[PDB]
Amino acid sequence: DQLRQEAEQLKNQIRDARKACADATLSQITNNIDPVGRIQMRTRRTLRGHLAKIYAMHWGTDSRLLVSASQDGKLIIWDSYTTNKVHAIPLRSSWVMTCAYAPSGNYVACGGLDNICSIYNLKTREGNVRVSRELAGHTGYLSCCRFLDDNQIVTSSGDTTCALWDIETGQQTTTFTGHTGDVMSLSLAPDTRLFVSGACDASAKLWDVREGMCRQTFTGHESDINAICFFPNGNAFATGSDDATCRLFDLRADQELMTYSHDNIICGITSVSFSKSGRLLLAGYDDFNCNVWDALKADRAGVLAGHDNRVSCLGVTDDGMAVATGSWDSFLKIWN
Template sequence: MGDKDGKAKLQALREELQSLKEKGHNGTMETQTISPLPNSTFKARRQLKGHFGKVYAMHWAGKSSAEELVSASQDGKLIVWNAQTTFKKQAIPLRSSWVMTCAFEQDTNQMVACGGLDNLCSIYKVDGETTTTSRATKELQAHDGYLSCCRFIGSQNILTSSGDSTCIYWDIERGEPLSSFTDHNGDVMSVAVHPTDRNLFVSGSCDATSKLFDIRQQGCVATFVGHESDINAVNFFPNGMCFGTGSDDSSCRMFDLRCYQEVNTFMSDRILCGITSVAFSQSGRLLLAGYDDYMTHVWDALKPNASSPAFSTDKNQGHENRVSCLGVSSDGGALCTGSWDTLLKVYA
């Protein structure tokens, strides 16, 4: 009798949750009148050449230094670039060349971080005066697996994700974990911090789910399903109401935080490879994604269940190997892509 009562209560809770979701899901893309995108494409304006190994990650600086970015390569170097002039502002040799992620601190633009198969998050000062830096100011050690992604939350804290299926929120000055998030059942491949509320972040994992976390609650707030394979990349919509994902199932998807549901899918029968990275334009109209087939495809984020990209980067101006990372500058004026062909390209 007790088991039956428990099952009945569980079913009632499920129905109540579904009802609340449907109440928040008060419209679809198909019901909206959407103006078409103008015929346009991105052109490669700059080429950042200086790495001698595969480029694995890049990240733009904050708005006060919107033309700067940091990149990480298998050659064992972090390079801080001025994307406008293509000058290398700082080169940082790493203890381990197996780097998988890098991040630029967004408030003061005076720190960069990286990590990879060494299981560490290493943080370096960027002062603009010295051209080389050899020693990390902090090395954060608590993960039991490779570091897949890191993102600063202000100048005092950083968020990391790992192959050990966890995310950790750190105090940089003390070098100590403040919170650990263990809700995923597979490697966590990417994290993104909410653009207006630094207590919230979203993650993507090899368990094919993405999750919303609240640092104050030290746990998962919501789980988003829909992908059929590893989620390699997550990124927030500019207003923070939605986020986009990219997966090995060859699709990008958009999820809404208000109704806890998927609101759009972007995939094509002609694109059969995985997605490595995603980003939104400053207006949110464009979803940009880097692919294993050397291409960067641009989707109309408002077009329902898009079956083909709005446009793609020119093959003649594109990369000659896997597009491993991409990002839109903090002022929205440029797109940078990094590739296993050792190059970074800046489009506008």
């Protein structure tokens, strides 16, 4: 009863303190920065091995190999330089909505409608890729998963829950339960010490991995949050949603910084990533093409239009040399 009014008053205090900590907008500060100019990105490679729509994709830290997962029951690992298929792992469940590629390169992970995260050991004897481990405990479809190291893995599921697992033990070590809607995205900080997670309640929560409690909560979207990605310095992140708008928040300022939106855009976001320096924002849409925004000027600096269906996954190499976009036409495009 009175606790609801207490929560209302606390939210009141939070947002007029956030207003009290706002002086000038990002646009007002960055009006003095020269625009990046119209950048033209040409497709350099087309990885054509998948038969169904591609749902996930992840780059290696060496920025050469990339893993991609399709609904045809296969996740395959490509050498992007030569377009050769290094590996082709068949999945026990054809319903895969996420995949991650370990920073060491020794493992890959996948998951989906089966509520199980499967870790495959790439670098083993016997010359085959075998299921190193299966993680169960989530009661909803897995939306995302990232590798903290060779033994710690963070998953987000559609049961409004994120979890940190010890792979060797095989069971959850931490359970983050703050969201109310289905968690659909995930992004680790560059230091892999805290991470953000955007859910279907139009809210993005920031979690401290070590202690397991939510630090800050960010609102501002009207619809489901589909993608999230930290800024390279780790002090900001961008989110995309179904209301066809992206927005850049800030941790220390604790409030939204910029809103990337165009009246010509009416289709929701599916994937968000920054560039090497953070000056560009790459956003994948349902209108079958990617957009490149000036992250500081908030104007569409470019368009990546080469896909015949919606772009479902998008990633940028660690060295920033290229950007890979997957889509529902079963082809990956490596742009540079």
